[PDB]
Enzyme design. Structure first.
Site, PDB file in Angstrom:
ATOM      1  N   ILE A  75      86.086  44.979  38.241  1.00  0.00           N
ATOM      2  CA  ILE A  75      86.223  43.640  38.830  1.00  0.00           C
ATOM      3  C   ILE A  75      87.612  43.082  38.469  1.00  0.00           C
ATOM      4  O   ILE A  75      88.274  42.505  39.322  1.00  0.00           O
ATOM      5  CB  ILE A  75      85.084  42.705  38.300  1.00  0.00           C
ATOM      6  CG1 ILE A  75      83.737  43.083  38.876  1.00  0.00           C
ATOM      7  CG2 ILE A  75      85.368  41.213  38.547  1.00  0.00           C
ATOM      8  CD1 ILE A  75      82.628  42.783  37.914  1.00  0.00           C
ATOM      9  N   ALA A  76      88.014  43.205  37.184  1.00  0.00           N
ATOM     10  CA  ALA A  76      89.250  42.655  36.632  1.00  0.00           C
ATOM     11  C   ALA A  76      89.537  43.291  35.279  1.00  0.00           C
ATOM     12  O   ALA A  76      88.658  43.939  34.708  1.00  0.00           O
ATOM     13  CB  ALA A  76      89.095  41.144  36.438  1.00  0.00           C
ATOM     14  N   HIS A  77      90.744  43.042  34.740  1.00  0.00           N
ATOM     15  CA  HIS A  77      91.163  43.511  33.429  1.00  0.00           C
ATOM     16  C   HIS A  77      91.547  42.280  32.621  1.00  0.00           C
ATOM     17  O   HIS A  77      92.297  41.422  33.110  1.00  0.00           O
ATOM     18  CB  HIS A  77      92.354  44.482  33.545  1.00  0.00           C
ATOM     19  CG  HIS A  77      92.881  44.974  32.222  1.00  0.00           C
ATOM     20  ND1 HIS A  77      93.906  44.326  31.568  1.00  0.00           N
ATOM     21  CD2 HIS A  77      92.518  46.064  31.501  1.00  0.00           C
ATOM     22  CE1 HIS A  77      94.134  45.036  30.470  1.00  0.00           C
ATOM     23  NE2 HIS A  77      93.300  46.081  30.385  1.00  0.00           N
ATOM     24  N   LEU A  80      89.933  41.993  26.487  1.00  0.00           N
ATOM     25  CA  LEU A  80      89.057  43.021  25.934  1.00  0.00           C
ATOM     26  C   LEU A  80      88.954  44.260  26.867  1.00  0.00           C
ATOM     27  O   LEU A  80      88.014  45.058  26.750  1.00  0.00           O
ATOM     28  CB  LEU A  80      87.653  42.428  25.664  1.00  0.00           C
ATOM     29  CG  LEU A  80      87.358  41.922  24.255  1.00  0.00           C
ATOM     30  CD1 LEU A  80      86.097  41.055  24.239  1.00  0.00           C
ATOM     31  CD2 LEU A  80      87.240  43.070  23.263  1.00  0.00           C
ATOM     32  N   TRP A  82      88.861  46.299  30.671  1.00  0.00           N
ATOM     33  CA  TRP A  82      88.213  46.246  31.981  1.00  0.00           C
ATOM     34  C   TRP A  82      86.856  45.558  31.988  1.00  0.00           C
ATOM     35  O   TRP A  82      86.102  45.647  31.015  1.00  0.00           O
ATOM     36  CB  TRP A  82      88.095  47.657  32.592  1.00  0.00           C
ATOM     37  CG  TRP A  82      89.422  48.175  33.058  1.00  0.00           C
ATOM     38  CD1 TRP A  82      90.215  49.084  32.434  1.00  0.00           C
ATOM     39  CD2 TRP A  82      90.101  47.800  34.258  1.00  0.00           C
ATOM     40  NE1 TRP A  82      91.355  49.296  33.170  1.00  0.00           N
ATOM     41  CE2 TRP A  82      91.329  48.491  34.276  1.00  0.00           C
ATOM     42  CE3 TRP A  82      89.850  46.844  35.258  1.00  0.00           C
ATOM     43  CZ2 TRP A  82      92.267  48.319  35.291  1.00  0.00           C
ATOM     44  CZ3 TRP A  82      90.769  46.686  36.278  1.00  0.00           C
ATOM     45  CH2 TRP A  82      91.978  47.396  36.273  1.00  0.00           C
ATOM     46  N   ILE A  83      86.584  44.885  33.094  1.00  0.00           N
ATOM     47  CA  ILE A  83      85.332  44.191  33.431  1.00  0.00           C
ATOM     48  C   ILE A  83      84.764  44.966  34.577  1.00  0.00           C
ATOM     49  O   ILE A  83      85.385  45.064  35.631  1.00  0.00           O
ATOM     50  CB  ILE A  83      85.534  42.678  33.785  1.00  0.00           C
ATOM     51  CG1 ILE A  83      86.330  41.886  32.726  1.00  0.00           C
ATOM     52  CG2 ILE A  83      84.195  42.022  34.061  1.00  0.00           C
ATOM     53  CD1 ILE A  83      85.959  42.049  31.346  1.00  0.00           C
ATOM     54  N   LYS A  99      81.166  44.091  30.113  1.00  0.00           N
ATOM     55  CA  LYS A  99      82.419  43.797  29.407  1.00  0.00           C
ATOM     56  C   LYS A  99      82.317  44.304  27.959  1.00  0.00           C
ATOM     57  O   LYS A  99      81.264  44.154  27.347  1.00  0.00           O
ATOM     58  CB  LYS A  99      82.673  42.273  29.444  1.00  0.00           C
ATOM     59  CG  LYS A  99      83.877  41.770  28.636  1.00  0.00           C
ATOM     60  CD  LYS A  99      83.950  40.220  28.737  1.00  0.00           C
ATOM     61  CE  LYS A  99      85.181  39.671  28.049  1.00  0.00           C
ATOM     62  NZ  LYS A  99      85.193  38.173  28.049  1.00  0.00           N
ATOM     63  N   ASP A 194      85.712  27.722  24.133  1.00  0.00           N
ATOM     64  CA  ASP A 194      86.792  28.271  24.956  1.00  0.00           C
ATOM     65  C   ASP A 194      86.919  27.591  26.285  1.00  0.00           C
ATOM     66  O   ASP A 194      87.255  28.229  27.294  1.00  0.00           O
ATOM     67  CB  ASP A 194      86.634  29.778  25.102  1.00  0.00           C
ATOM     68  CG  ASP A 194      87.935  30.511  25.383  1.00  0.00           C
ATOM     69  OD1 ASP A 194      89.024  29.879  25.262  1.00  0.00           O
ATOM     70  OD2 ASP A 194      87.868  31.668  25.825  1.00  0.00           O
TER      71      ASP A 194
END
Ligand SMILES: Nc1ncnc2c1ncn2[C@@H]1O[C@H](COP(=O)(O)OP(=O)(O)O)[C@@H](O)[C@H]1O
Ligand SMILES: [Mg+2]
Ligand SMILES: [Mg+2]
Ligand SMILES: [Zn+2]
Length: 322
Positions: A75-77, A80, A82-83, A99, A194
């Protein structure tokens, strides 16, 4: 004939990290860069701190995690790594998100990471991403790594650049939907820690908080990490508190609505003088200053109190906008 396309394909990104986005998770320095001498490696060790890095996906399409999750892709990086997008075999093949929990660690370190975050499965709020499971899988080198399993949240984050800041009424209406989630967390002795635009997802139906990695008990000092420009100044002395979460609400509203000065890539503390937005909406400016007060005792005592004042401000902004 019109084609039958798998809608998951449009939701996934190419599993390569561009060189400009490669940094060491430990020391923050650029890693895996090509120079006038040699090509940048996708995995190796940081030349400065010696920490191992890898920009390669650790779960491949077709991999089955804990006999339950069928990996579809990335999905994204992030910070932590890659997702991943996966399909949950126990919940009707519903797409879910995986994740990693730690940047590095042996079997015992992975097991400890999973156990310490297990309480997130108990967090139940319509505006907070649901955590379904904590699972173990082997990485690209054959060493076991831990993963958090969460609900796939549609849409995009509230992060806005200098040219696309939200109108004040829109930003306030968004945070009024977020404040009850913070009140819910505070009621069970937890701090979100956060809050920032990047961690708030805007879907076709609602707002949802993601990235539960910083979620911690009130007055604990195990996790003091934060973003300069969002984190409360006294966090080192008090640890996460309701006061530190209120501060982040103030900084989040400011980052969504104001053309805040930035220095060395971060927002500077306080609010800029003679800002057109704060001169336009006085009660809004007063609320922001109270929320970000350097003295935590001067900030809103509870998220419910902040919500009460914020509703008052929304009525005033809406009236002024006429
Ligand atoms: N639960 C989720 N559902 C859908 N997309 C997600 C989810 N969690 C993360 N993402 C995607 O990954 C991006 C980064 O997520 P995040 O947890 O903030 O990672 P990081 O803090 O490492 O950058 C999000 O902006 C979103 O596009
Ligand atoms: Mg994040
Ligand atoms: Mg995080
Ligand atoms: Zn390093």
């Amino acid at each position: 004939r019109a084609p039958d396309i798998d809608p998951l394909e449009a939701l996934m990104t190419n599993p390569v990290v561009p060189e400009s986005k490669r940094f060491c998770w430990n020391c923050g320095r650029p890693v895996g860069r090509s120079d006038s001498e040699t090509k940048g490696a996708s995995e190796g060790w940081c030349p400065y701190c010696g920490s191992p890095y890898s920009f390669l996906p650790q779960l491949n399409p077709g991999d089955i995690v804990a006999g339950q999750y069928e990996v579809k892709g990335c999905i994204a990086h992030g910070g932590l790594g890659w997702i991943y997008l996966a399909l949950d075999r126990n919940v009707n093949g519903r797409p879910v998100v995986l994740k990693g929990l730690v940047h590095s660690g042996d079997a015992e370190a992975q097991a400890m990471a999973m156990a310490e975050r297990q309480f997130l499965a108990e967090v139940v709020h319509p505006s907070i991403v649901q955590i379904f499971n904590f699972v173990e899988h082997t990485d690209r080198h054959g060493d076991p790594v831990g993963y958090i399993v969460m609900e796939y949240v549609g849409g995009q984050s509230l992060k806005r650049s200098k040219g696309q800041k939200l109108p004040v009424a829109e930003a306030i209406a968004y945070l009024l939907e977020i404040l009850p989630a913070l009140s819910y967390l505070h009621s069970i002795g937890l701090v979100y820690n956060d809050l920032k635009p990047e961690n708030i997802m805007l879907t076709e139906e609602q707002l949802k908080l993601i990235d539960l990695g910083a979620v911690s008990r009130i007055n604990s000092f195990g996790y003091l990490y934060g973003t300069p420009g969002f984190q409360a100044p006294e966090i080192v002395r008090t640890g996460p508190t309701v006061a530190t979460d209120i501060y982040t609400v103030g900084r989040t509203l400011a980052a969504l609505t104001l053309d805040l000065p930035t220095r060395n890539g971060r927002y500077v503390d306080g609010l800029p003088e003679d800002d057109p937005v704060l001169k336009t909406y006085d009660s809004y400016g007063r609320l922001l200053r109270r929320a970000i007060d350097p003295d935590p005792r001067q900030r809103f005592t509870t998220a419910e109190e902040m919500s009460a004042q914020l509703t008052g401000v929304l009525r005033e902004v809406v009236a002024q906008d006429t």
